[PDB]
Design an enzyme around this catalytic site. Structure first.
Site, PDB file in Angstrom:
ATOM      1  N   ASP A  46      15.105 -42.871 -24.899  1.00 21.72           N
ATOM      2  CA  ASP A  46      14.432 -43.336 -26.098  1.00 21.72           C
ATOM      3  C   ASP A  46      13.838 -42.187 -26.884  1.00 21.72           C
ATOM      4  O   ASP A  46      13.056 -41.415 -26.368  1.00 21.72           O
ATOM      5  CB  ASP A  46      13.323 -44.323 -25.741  1.00 21.72           C
ATOM      6  N   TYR A  51       9.398 -38.553 -33.403  1.00 17.05           N
ATOM      7  CA  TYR A  51       9.110 -37.682 -32.268  1.00 17.05           C
ATOM      8  C   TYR A  51       9.350 -36.179 -32.444  1.00 17.05           C
ATOM      9  O   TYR A  51       8.883 -35.400 -31.632  1.00 17.05           O
ATOM     10  CB  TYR A  51       9.820 -38.173 -31.007  1.00 17.05           C
ATOM     11  N   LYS A  80      15.215 -44.222 -33.996  1.00 13.66           N
ATOM     12  CA  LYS A  80      14.431 -45.203 -34.707  1.00 13.66           C
ATOM     13  C   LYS A  80      14.310 -44.740 -36.146  1.00 13.66           C
ATOM     14  O   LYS A  80      14.087 -43.554 -36.410  1.00 13.66           O
ATOM     15  CB  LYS A  80      13.057 -45.392 -34.059  1.00 13.66           C
ATOM     16  N   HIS A 113      11.589 -48.746 -36.691  1.00 15.28           N
ATOM     17  CA  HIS A 113      10.527 -48.255 -35.809  1.00 15.28           C
ATOM     18  C   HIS A 113       9.283 -49.127 -35.904  1.00 15.28           C
ATOM     19  O   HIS A 113       8.624 -49.388 -34.888  1.00 15.28           O
ATOM     20  CB  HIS A 113      10.172 -46.799 -36.122  1.00 15.28           C
TER      21      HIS A 113
END
Ligand SMILES: NC(=O)c1ccc[n+]([C@@H]2O[C@H](COP(=O)([O-])OP(=O)(O)OC[C@H]3O[C@@H](n4cnc5c(N)ncnc54)[C@H](OP(=O)(O)O)[C@@H]3O)[C@@H](O)[C@H]2O)c1
Ligand SMILES: Cc1ccc(NC(=O)c2cc3cccc(O)c3oc2=N)cc1
Length: 316
Positions: A46, A51, A80, A113
């Site tokens: 994931d 990120y 996402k 997201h």
């Protein structure tokens, strides 16, 4: 080893490796630990544009494919779509940019997201002069259409959503001309916040519930209150850990697996990465399940109500 069948006919491994680490942690670590997670046995990874590690995580996946450890088909990779990209004309390029960064041809899973749309720009969180975030008004069904277009292009095998409540799920499900429903909804889930009836809904709709912060959040100070309970210090999890000769984290993960929840686990520590896959090695009793069910306290770790004004704010 185990996978669940997705409503679009694809298969999602029920244990996933969470890759988020705060800006402090050097980006090189994302590469190392993701290789470790693959070596350990994780096959579901994931990640997200948010990120800032897609390059490193994708490089780890390409490295394990190239050294012959797995094939692209063995890995289930999630990215996402960030909330500054909800306008439909921004959806496909955001995905293509994620794929260019990760150096893969497709993601197995593309998620919206969050439902809370933000102002479009190359800023991840646009702020006005007073330092508050600027929202955008977007009909998320148009976002969903652009997501469906990504599916047809083959850029994403499966498409789903994240941080959506019941009404937002149904708003996507009621959509006219819907080509694909979300294979999954990825939300915060753990013994303090079990999502029992959200999960029941999803089971009714053939939508997998995916747990994140399932070990209790990384307890970041910027987003989480220090006075909150630490999930892994919980008396009942610690007791069950000593009873099964496992750890509280393994208890939490197994808890989700046995309620039919796909569960994520972040760890940037090599020992814990290799320990987390032991979740397939033991079972909790029905009574153990009942006792963990008893911990439900409707507790969010992510303090989000600084965004309560948002019309798509999920905890309305
Ligand atoms: N959709 C969303 O909005 C959303 C939001 C948050 C997170 N996520 C995803 O979910 C993933 C996981 O959630 P999370 O980041 O909140 O963390 P998490 O899975 O709750 O993990 C929390 C902490 O537990 C520690 N830990 C891991 N394995 C352990 C073990 N066996 N024993 C004891 N402690 C252990 C880890 O620290 P060490 O690193 O020191 O092991 C980790 O920092 C993220 O990485 C991200 O991919 C998604
Ligand atoms: C108006 C608005 C829009 C979106 C959000 N959401 C977040 O701040 C997130 C933080 C986060 C943090 C770690 C890992 C994630 O996966 C995360 O995912 C998120 N969506 C909040 C307010």
């Amino acid at each position: 080893h185990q996978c669940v069948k997705l409503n679009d006919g694809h298969f999602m491994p029920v244990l996933g490796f969470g890759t988020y680490a705060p800006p402090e942690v050097p980006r090189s670590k994302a590469l190392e630990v993701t290789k470790l997670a693959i070596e350990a046995g994780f096959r579901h990874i994931d990640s997200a544009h948010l990120y800032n590690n897609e390059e490193q995580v994708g490089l780890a996946i390409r490295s394990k494919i190239a050294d012959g450890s797995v094939k692209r088909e063995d890995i289930f990779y999630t990215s996402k779509l960030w909330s500054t990209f909800h306008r439909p004309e921004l959806v496909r390029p955001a995905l293509e940019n994620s794929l260019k960064k990760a150096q893969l041809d497709y993601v197995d899973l593309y998620l919206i997201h969050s439902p809370m749309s933000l102002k479009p720009g190359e800023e991840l969180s646009p702020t006005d002069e007073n330092g508050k975030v600027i929202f955008d008004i977007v009909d998320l069904c148009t976002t969903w259409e652009a997501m469906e277009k990504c599916k047809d292009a083959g850029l994403a095998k499966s498409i789903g959503v994240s941080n959506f409540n019941r009404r937002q799920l149904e708003m996507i499900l009621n959509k006219p001309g819907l080509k694909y429903k979300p294979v999954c909804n990825q939300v915060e889930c753990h013994p303090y916040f079990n999502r029992s009836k959200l999960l029941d809904f999803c089971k009714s709709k053939d939508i997998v519930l995916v747990a994140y912060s399932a070990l209790g959040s990384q307890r970041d100070k910027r987003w989480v209150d220090p006075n909150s309970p630490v999930l892994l210090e919980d008396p009942v999890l610690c007791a069950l850990a000593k009873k099964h000769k496992r750890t509280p984290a393994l208890i939490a993960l197994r808890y989700q697996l046995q309620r039919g929840v796909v569960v994520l686990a972040k760890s940037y520590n090599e020992q814990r990465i290799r320990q987390n896959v032991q979740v397939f090695e033991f079972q909790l009793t029905a009574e153990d399940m009942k006792a963990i069910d008893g911990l439900d306290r409707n507790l969010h770790y992510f303090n989000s109500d600084s965004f309560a004004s948002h019309p798509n704010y999920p905890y309305s």
